[PDB]
Structures are given as C-alpha cells and as structure tokens.
Amino acid sequence: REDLDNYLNEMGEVTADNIQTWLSGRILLIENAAQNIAINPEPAAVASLLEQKALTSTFMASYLGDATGHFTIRPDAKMPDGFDPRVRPWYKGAESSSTSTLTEPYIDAATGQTIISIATAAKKAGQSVGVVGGDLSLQTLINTLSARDGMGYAFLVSADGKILVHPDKALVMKSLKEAYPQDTPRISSDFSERIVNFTPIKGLPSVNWYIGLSVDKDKAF
C-alpha cells in the first residue's frame, strides 16, 4: 500500500507538471495576443493578429470582445443572434482577474461543442481595451490527458470538486459527490476508496485545479 501510494503520488505529480506545461504555453500565446492587440486595437489590426497560424493552429478560434459588445473572431463565424461576449464566462472571468484565466467547460456559442477558454484582459497602459480569448475543445483536453500516461485514467477536477475533464464525458461538470454518490472521494485527502488520489496542478494562473488519478485497485501492483 505504501508502494502503490508512492507510485500514484509520483504519477500524479508527473501528469500534473506536464499538463501545466501543456497549458502554460497556450496561456502565453493568448497573453501575447492580448499584449499585441493593446498595441493596436483597431479591428483590422486585431483581425490580422487573430488570423495568424500560431493561433489558428493552436485554438479552435481566438477572439476579442469589448465593453461595447463588439466581437471579432478568427476563423470567422456567424455568432447566434443576440450573442454578447460580455456575458460569456471567459469575459467575466478575465475581467475579475488581474492575470489570465481558464474557464471551466461550457457550451461554445460558435460550434455548440463543449469547450474551455483561456482568456486575459487586454490593457493599454492601465486602461482595459477588451478581453482576448482562445478556445480548446473538451475532446482536445481529454486527448491531452489520456496521452499523459500506467494503470487507470487521469481526470481533471477543480479544488471545489467539480469534474472538469474526464474520459467519461457524462461526468464532465458533475461534482465529485454527484459523480460518485456512494463513497465520495474528497480532494481534502490524497487517497480515496478504483482508488483515486488528487495532485494539485501548480502554476496555473487564477485557478486551483487537481489531477485525479483513478486506477483499478486490485489490478494494481
């Protein structure tokens, strides 16, 4: 048991570091996008920035919304009638953060897919000029986790217990209790009766997220 605990802990730390280092490169691209837009926030300049291959190859789309409701998105897309960027979770979350942020999964207004967004406020010498966001699909996050490793699966859960990414998509945005009503695992401890442990992801901006490692117990050696 000491041996399995030591290994799950070590695997959790590995998986956690790597997803942190997958995310933080993508967080830099958005921050750089926001910084460059703050240079020249004319919508022509904005649109040429978002059309660049480093962004379009990395994200489903990236975009700028501002306090008047103006919205520029690339690749371009017809947004639903009455779409307002200011009421979307990426906008509200970047507004209330002095750093960049990452949203919990939500329903993309463009694709209708489930997505998360990296967003940060774009600031021109103290003044906000809007919020820049980039979108990653839930399926992308599942694939990025399931690529990161021996015995069970990794999933991602917020500190408050909300399951964010899980290879069982039915469990996405269920709380731990709602997903696991009989004997609920607790983040508060780092082992739970499958055996499950939680490893904090360090160094993300604005969020407190955990890697959960879930392994078939008796198969584990």
> What is the contact surface with ligand PRO in residues (CB under 6 A)?
61, 63, 73, 88, 108-110, 117, 133, 135
Nearer to ligand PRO, 88 or 166 (CB): 88
**Cβ distance to ligand PRO smaller for residue 110 or 122:** 110
Task: Find the shortest distance in angstroms from Cβ 84 to ligand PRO.
Answer: 9
Nearest distance from C-beta of residue 11 to ligand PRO, angstroms: 33
Minimum distance, C-beta of residue 87 to ligand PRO, in the bound complex (Å) = 9
Least distance in angstroms from the C-beta of 69 to ligand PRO: 12
**What's the 3-state SS for the chain?**
CHHHHHHHHHHHHHHHHHHHHHHHHHHHHHHHHHHHHHHCCCHHHHHHHHCCHHHHCCCCCEEEECCCCCEEEECCCCCCCCCCHHHCHHHHHHHCCCCCEECCCEECCCCCCEEEEEEEEEEECCEEEEEEEEEEEHHHHHHHHHHCCCCEEEEEEECCCEEEECCCHHHCCCEHHHHCCCCCCCCCCCCECCEEEEEECCCCCCCCEEEEEEECCCCCC
> Which CB sits closer to ligand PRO, 64 or 211?
64
Residue with smaller CB distance to ligand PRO, 47 or 109 = 109
